[PDB]
């Protein structure tokens, strides 16, 4: 049962991203062959995380997402004991060595306001920073602190709208937007 959305994900994202997304999905007991919309969402969120960490200086960001869930925690306690930051209940996506906070990245196909609220009520941990990106170019960050400069964020927004267009050109966008 091979879908069009699966082969599009394989062609749209680089192999290191696809491989990390694949291992992550099966690690949590889900199949990219059938949960193909979610497959696209993880690859997208993963690519945004990597683009984000490339937006700062050389070694400003520590990347948590994409790691195996045990090692992703391992680096968190190391960070927590090193900087004295509260250990989050949820696994965050990044750590900003410059701002000394964990970051949760969000990528949404719906309204940016509502998704932040959902992510804020679920986190309930005031320490971690929250940064939401939309497939139409809206971004929302905790305390209106968007961490990176405009150029790095604009690059992420541009790629998101390219992913949207490519899905739409293949009639897969409507299914993707309704799946979230
Ligand atoms: O880290 C996350 N989930 C863990 C657990 C897990 C499970 C499967 C595969 C991978 C992972 C890692 C994580 N989850 C989410 C979303 C909403 C909250 C639950 N959720 C999902 O389970 C859906 S999948 C997804 C969808 C969109 C973007 C990114 C992802 Cl992964 N949104 C994030 O921004 C995030 O970082
Ligand atoms: Mn995550
Ligand atoms: Mn995230």
UniProtKB/Swiss-Prot annotation:
Motif (Nuclear localization signal 1 (NLS1)): 109-124
Effect of residue 27 to K: Reduced affinity for Baloxavir and Baloxavir marboxil
Posttranslational mods: Phosphorylated on serines and threonines by host kinases, including human casein kinase II.
Entry function: Plays an essential role in viral RNA transcription and replication by forming the heterotrimeric polymerase complex together with PB1 and PB2 subunits. The complex transcribes viral mRNAs by using a unique mechanism called cap-snatching. It consists in the hijacking and cleavage of host capped pre-mRNAs. These short capped RNAs are then used as primers for viral mRNAs. The PB2 subunit is responsible for the binding of the 5' cap of cellular pre-mRNAs which are subsequently cleaved after 10-13 nucleotides by the PA subunit that carries the endonuclease activity.
Protein family: Belongs to the influenza viruses PA family.
Subunit and interaction comment: Influenza RNA polymerase is composed of three subunits: PB1, PB2 and PA. Interacts (via C-terminus) with PB1 (via N-terminus).
Name of the featured protein: Polymerase acidic protein
Lineage: Viruses, Riboviria, Orthornavirae, Negarnaviricota, Polyploviricotina
Residue numbers of the full-length protein present here: 1 to 195 of 716
């Amino acid at each position: 049962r091979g879908s069009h959305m699966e082969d599009f994900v394989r062609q749209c994202f680089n192999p290191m991203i696809v491989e990390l997304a694949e291992k992550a999905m099966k690690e949590y007991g889900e199949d990219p062959k059938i949960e193909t919309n979610k497959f696209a969402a993880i690859c997208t969120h993963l690519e945004v995380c990597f683009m984000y960490s490339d937006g700062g200086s050389k070694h400003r960001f520590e990347i948590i997402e994409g790691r195996d869930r045990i090692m992703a925690w391992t680096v968190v306690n190391s960070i927590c004991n090193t900087t004295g930051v509260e250990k989050p209940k949820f696994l965050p996506d990044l750590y900003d060595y410059k701002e000394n906070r964990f970051i949760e990245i969000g990528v949404t196909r719906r309204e940016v306001h509502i998704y932040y609220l959902e992510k804020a009520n679920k986190i309930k941990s005031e320490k971690t920073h929250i940064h939401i990106f939309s497939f139409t170019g809206e971004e929302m960050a905790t305390k209106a602190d968007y961490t990176l400069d405009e150029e790095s964020r604009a690059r992420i927004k541009t790629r998101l709208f390219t992913i949207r267009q490519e899905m739409a050109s293949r009639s897969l966008w409507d299914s993707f937007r309704q799946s979230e």
